[PDB]
């Protein structure tokens, strides 16, 4: 969990 993933 990096809070930057392309979802």
């Amino acid at each position, epitope marked *: *969990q*990096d*809070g*930057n*993933e392309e*979802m």
Partner: antibody
Amino acid sequence: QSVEESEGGLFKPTDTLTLTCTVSGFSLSSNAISWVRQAPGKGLEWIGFVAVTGYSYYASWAKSRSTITRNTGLNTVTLKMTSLTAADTATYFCARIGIGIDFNIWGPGTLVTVSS
Amino acid sequence: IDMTQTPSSKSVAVGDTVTINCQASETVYKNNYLAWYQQKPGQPPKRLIYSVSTLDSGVPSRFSGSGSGTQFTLTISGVQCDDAATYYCAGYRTTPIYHIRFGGGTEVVVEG
């Protein structure tokens, strides 16, 4: 590598909580740091985190009162929570939470009591 | 997302097998961003399993994890007194907003 929460303690209702998480032995710039709290005898509750980008995201219940900020030069992540009530009494943890990644590290927690 | 853990408590005898279920209300990230933590009183939670089934370093092999998407299971095969603790699943979801969610916990009492 380790993380450590600054001192909590006793707060009056309507006070603002400010906790610091200090990071050692790993790079804050590329690691997302969460704040998680646990009321006495209850379960873990994610508050929010600062992403590897430096921008923060929050649980919907926490968004209006909570600010999570990082200072990469000081190796710190700060949790500010306004408008405290007894419901905010808990142990507060900071953590690099590894749910789908190898790196995972949790602090020892600090006790926050909100009471008159 | 909601994370529903069942059962919320269980008493088990030494040597038994314990099964804990975690149901997410939507799929976790990449269908496998799901981890299991073990917490004893006064301690931070200790990660046991991440990415559904990967054992953390030094975790005994009697712990195994399975599942995908929204349904996950933690199995303790041959439970020991050292395993008496509360267990939490933890999932990650990126949409509509990045967030982590813990299950409500399962308190495991071990009968010696």
